[PDB]
Amino acid sequence: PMFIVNTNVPRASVPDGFLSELTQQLAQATGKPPQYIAVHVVPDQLMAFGGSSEPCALCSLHSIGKIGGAQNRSYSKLLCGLLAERLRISPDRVYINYYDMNAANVGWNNSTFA
Amino acid sequence: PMFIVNTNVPRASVPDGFLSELTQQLAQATGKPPQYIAVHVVPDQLMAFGGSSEPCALCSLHSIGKIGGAQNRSYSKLLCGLLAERLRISPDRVYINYYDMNAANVGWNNSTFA
Amino acid sequence: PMFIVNTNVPRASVPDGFLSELTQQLAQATGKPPQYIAVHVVPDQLMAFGGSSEPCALCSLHSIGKIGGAQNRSYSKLLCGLLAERLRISPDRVYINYYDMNAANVGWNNSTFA
Numbered sequence: 001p002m003f004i005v006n007t008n009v010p011r012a013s014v015p016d017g018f019l020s021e022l023t024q025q026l027a028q029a030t031g032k033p034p035q036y037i038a039v040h041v042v043p044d045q046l047m048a049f050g051g052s053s054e055p056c057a058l059c060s061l062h063s064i065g066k067i068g069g070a071q072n073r074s075y076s077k078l079l080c081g082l083l084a085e086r087l088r089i090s091p092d093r094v095y096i097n098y099y100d101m102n103a104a105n106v107g108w109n110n111s112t113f114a
Numbered sequence: 115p116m117f118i119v120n121t122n123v124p125r126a127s128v129p130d131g132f133l134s135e136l137t138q139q140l141a142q143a144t145g146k147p148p149q150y151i152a153v154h155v156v157p158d159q160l161m162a163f164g165g166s167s168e169p170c171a172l173c174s175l176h177s178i179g180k181i182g183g184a185q186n187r188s189y190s191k192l193l194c195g196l197l198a199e200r201l202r203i204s205p206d207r208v209y210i211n212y213y214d215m216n217a218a219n220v221g222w223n224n225s226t227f228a
Numbered sequence: 229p230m231f232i233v234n235t236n237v238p239r240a241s242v243p244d245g246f247l248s249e250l251t252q253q254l255a256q257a258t259g260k261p262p263q264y265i266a267v268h269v270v271p272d273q274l275m276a277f278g279g280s281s282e283p284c285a286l287c288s289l290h291s292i293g294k295i296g297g298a299q300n301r302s303y304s305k306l307l308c309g310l311l312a313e314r315l316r317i318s319p320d321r322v323y324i325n326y327y328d329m330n331a332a333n334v335g336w337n338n339s340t341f342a
């Protein structure tokens with residue numbers, strides 16, 4: 001899976017070890033091996049949420065499977081909790097788009113997962 | 115909904131009020147309340163469009179519904195118009211990908227919209 | 229089509245002419261005119277792959293058609309090869325997500341491709 005967070009919070013406010021925490025928590029939540037988890041955090045962005053530039057985040061999670069109604073509710077609670085605790089972003093200022101990718105549409109290591 | 119614009123135009127050429135204009139115009143165009151509109155502008159990017167690096171933009175609009183043939187033509191006229199007027203990007207150097215998101219695949223506030 | 233690469237490799241390691249190489253190689257690979265190929269390279273990112281901060285890349289290719297099982301395997305070999313040769317990123321530290329876009333969902337030049 002791949003998790004991306006774009007935020008207006010400054011880089012210096014992203015704590016040390018945040019990418020590793022995201023990797024470990026996503027491996028556990030999605031069931032996927034840590035080897036297959038990629039994470040990307042983009043601070044210092046020019047963004048607004050509801051017209052306000054108070055701290056906010058726009059995120060995405062792409063995964064081959066492990067996406068669905070109940071699972072995405074669970075991921076949203078986990079990820080909003082991490083963003084609130086570590087980046088001090090209110091959960092009502094976070095969107096996370098979820099994508100269930102077909103294995104044929106994910107390239108890796110000179111091939112695809114199909 | 116969420117609107118993202120990535121552009122090679124420099125940050126100093128993004129005028130004051132641009133995120134607010136996008137928020138308000140997208141609220142009107144999508145019919146969704148502005149409280150629900152998130153916007154993200156990414157200037158100074160390393161980009162080419164058709165092999166050249168005159169001003170260009172790559173954008174996306176994600177929305178739960180309010181996406182379709184006619185609506186997307188209307189969004190493109192509105193958004194290209196704003197990028198031309200405010201960022202001086204020619205409409206023929208803009209791509210906007212549209213995504214009609216299922217409510218279960220949009221997280222917010224510790225849950226999803228489903 | 230649109231190709232985006234996000235990577236932790238530094239900007240100075242992206243060779244001169246890389247955007248043009250991606251444009252031309254993608255025009256050939258997809259069969260589409262170079263005028264329609266847009267490319268975006270984002271270096272210096274805060275990213276991890278498999279928990280590791282060694283060089284990695286997260287990429288996407290969006291195209292109206294020219295996406296499928298065999299084509300995506302061929303694109304992945306081409307693109308991993310370019311990232312390995314030009315950016316020194318190991319292919320097993322690259323993801324590429326592929327998207328077959330409906331023409332009605334790709335805006336351009338005040339309208340869509342539909």
Ligand SMILES: O=c1ccc2cc(O)c(O)cc2o1
Pocket residue numbers: 050092149150222
């Ligand atoms: O999904 C959303 C996004 C923003 C938002 C803002 C509000 O003030 C509210 O009452 C509900 C909301 O729901």
Ligand SMILES: [Cl-]
Pocket residue numbers: 001002036062063064
């Ligand atoms: Cl995956």
Ligand SMILES: [Cl-]
Pocket residue numbers: 067068069070071072
């Ligand atoms: Cl589920």
Ligand SMILES: [Cl-]
Pocket residue numbers: 100101102105
């Ligand atoms: Cl897919």
Ligand SMILES: [Cl-]
Pocket residue numbers: 115116176177178
């Ligand atoms: Cl929405």
Ligand SMILES: [Cl-]
Pocket residue numbers: 181182183184185186
């Ligand atoms: Cl429509």
Ligand SMILES: [Cl-]
Pocket residue numbers: 214215216219
């Ligand atoms: Cl969806």
Ligand SMILES: [Cl-]
Pocket residue numbers: 229230264290291292
């Ligand atoms: Cl295309």
Ligand SMILES: [Cl-]
Pocket residue numbers: 328329330333
């Ligand atoms: Cl589509």
